[model samples]
Target: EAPNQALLRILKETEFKKIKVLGSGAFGTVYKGLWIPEGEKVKIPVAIKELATSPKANKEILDEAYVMASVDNPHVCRLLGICLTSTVQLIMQLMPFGCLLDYVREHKDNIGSQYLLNWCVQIAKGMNYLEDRRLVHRDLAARNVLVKTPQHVKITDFGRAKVPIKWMALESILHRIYTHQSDVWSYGVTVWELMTFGSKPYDGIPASEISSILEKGERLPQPPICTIDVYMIMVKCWMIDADSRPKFRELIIEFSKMARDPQRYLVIQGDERMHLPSPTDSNFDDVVDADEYLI
Candidate 1:
């Protein structure tokens, strides 16, 4: 039996008050719940994913619960509990910042490059944990990343999450082969979304042409604020051969370096002169002098 199947508490529907619908996807409808635990004085915020009461959905919910329960990391969303009587619902920790896509759309102009870099790094760390467990996030993207706080985020909405055709890796698009490397490819576009503050991927192109475009070695153009070094990392992720892309562990290391050397990656508003540092420059120690350029 899965950990959640054996350990998760099955609660009565009355325990939670469904305040409103948060979102809905193919697997189920998500609700913002006011969790009134038995004998608890305060009502706490929670997310409830109510799966359709179908045999297929029940199985999928069980599998999702298993995967979620297996993960116990800060960067990944927490599975609070479940409701599995006549109706089925998966309880989860509430992310006040909502999805990364909505956050980017709302706070685009004010978010600093360093902050964006940190979000990207945190996401990579979360994905790295999943990768370490040999779990593939078939729908890894900004919409699936939930912001827990202004400075931190966590991966969520797994277990048959929606897949964006434009962000999927070439192999997955062409052959339905989902892998950790494909998640990396999706991560690249998520980072692109962050850099562009939620610009549509492959804007102006028909979805029908995405596979062919990517097959010919084409990818999303660099966001205006994306520094050359950062764009290069995105390019690395779009490598045609999945094996050629960096692993999640390797991604954390490289992204950490980018975070530390923000001067080279930070984009100043109204300034388009951000250039890539020379490949041979090992003197990152002196990069702090460029802090004056920070917005």
Candidate 2:
């Protein structure tokens, strides 16, 4: 039994008020919600994922709860509690900055490579924690990364307890076994998404052609905004053999070096500012960043 199974808090539906939809996928819809704990004064912001009650969903909810509640880290989203009411819901910490995809897309013209490097490390920090616990993300991508601040992001939506087909490792696609190394393959694309400012990976191509192309030593193109040094990190995760891929801890070391010396590592073709742009003027109050899928 997972330790969190005992610690998991059972919440009440009456305590939560739906604000708006955050994202929707095959599993369920995540809503930006307001909730107050028992005897609490203020209604705090939270995210509520509503899933239809069913035998399989119940199993999934348990899996997600166990995996989520067991994780105690700053770089990963917190599982606040759960409600087993008419509409099953999972409560999570609210990410006011939404997700990485929309955040980068909205601030594309202004993000500096400095911030990019930091995000790379931040992601590894989260993944390293997961890896340390002998867990696999199954699904790791920019869309699943939620931003609390420009310098801080957390991994969320552990629905399958999982992808863009493009983010999968060849090993998993060819075999039934999914390993931590497979997560590394997805991390490579997540990093690429950051460098590309959330541009669609392998856009305009049929999904059927990706595995074939990748097997032929083909990989996504380097981001125009990236330098060869920084680009190499992404490539390192895409190595054909899972045994050769860098572990998240190894990735953290490399990403940390770049974060510490942006000038030496992140030299790029575009803007070279050192600050993250504020999204104050951007009117994206209802930005729907549903980075979820089973496809």
Candidate 3:
């Protein structure tokens, strides 16, 4: 029997193209599908992410498709289409380079010299685009930031996004449910991932223990590659006070300026970034070989 017969049927009928499984997550599965019309010389690749089949989940996917279509920014992930039938799936633009979480770790040769400032700026721009429309990406993380090309980034995973609500005169502070500030917090975590080459904030910690770590203000180790300005930006994003956190608009503008700032980018004496081997920069073949663990 087919493992995912229902989904396969929908893919064949609506999508009607050969698929290459990209990866799987809590959300059903993602596939790279070639969309070639009846008689065409060119084949277009599209990313199809199926929902965990349920009426409510399907509705959520539909809403996500609608939201993505409305956004017109290059950094914001785009929803190309959807299979609205039985096995719900939201088709998105294909990202060839994959997620930043894996990219930074696998390519750690740039630890000392290559700064991820341009990539960071793209993320901040995406966040600013969403926030300006009163949208908050509640689940912004490394996994969500897909790299389409080196230095070109796109923000994805909008299933948890929420719209801002307003009160009579002032915004409700008590209703800090979801805000652009949370996105800033998520961005800070991503910066840590970028610097550490995909290291976890508190390695070996359980999900339930995350609160305690946050309460304790736990942060990533001071790796050799990280710069002072980068660390300062991360700390500002990690502040417990959400209101005090910088907005995506401010973050994007500041980072853009900082990228060109010689003072911010000057090579300091203590810069300890690694010099990984060529071709295959770093190896993640085994658990022990990864940089974050250091063991």
Candidate whose TM-score is highest? 2
- lDDT, ranked from best to worst: 2, 1, 3
User: Whose TM-score is higher: candidate 1's or candidate 2's?
Assistant: 2
Q: What is the lDDT of residue 196 in candidate 2?
A: 86
- Per-residue alpha-carbon lDDT of candidate 1 for residues 135-230, written as tens digits (9 for 90 to 100): 788888898899766677899866753348988998898899989999999999999999988888988898889988987878899888778888
**lDDT, candidate 3, residue 266?**
33
Model 1: how large is the Cα RMSD against the reference?
10.2
Predicted candidate 2 versus true structure: per-residue lDDT over 1-295, tens digit per residue:
4443437878888887899997898878989887765654556678888874678878877788877877778888877788988766888877878899999999877787678888888899998888877778888999999997687789986555523588889887767457888899899999999888898989998777988988999898988767788788788889888889898888888888877877676555565653463557652322222221101
TM-score, candidate 1, is 0.82
lDDT of 1: 0.78
The number of clashing residue pairs in model 2 is 0
User: Alpha-carbon error at 52 in model 3, in Å?
Assistant: 8.3
Better of 2 and 3 by lDDT: 2
Q: After superposition, how far is residue 222 of candidate 1 from its true place, in Å?
A: 1.0
Q: Number of clashes in every candidate structure?
A: 0, 0, 0
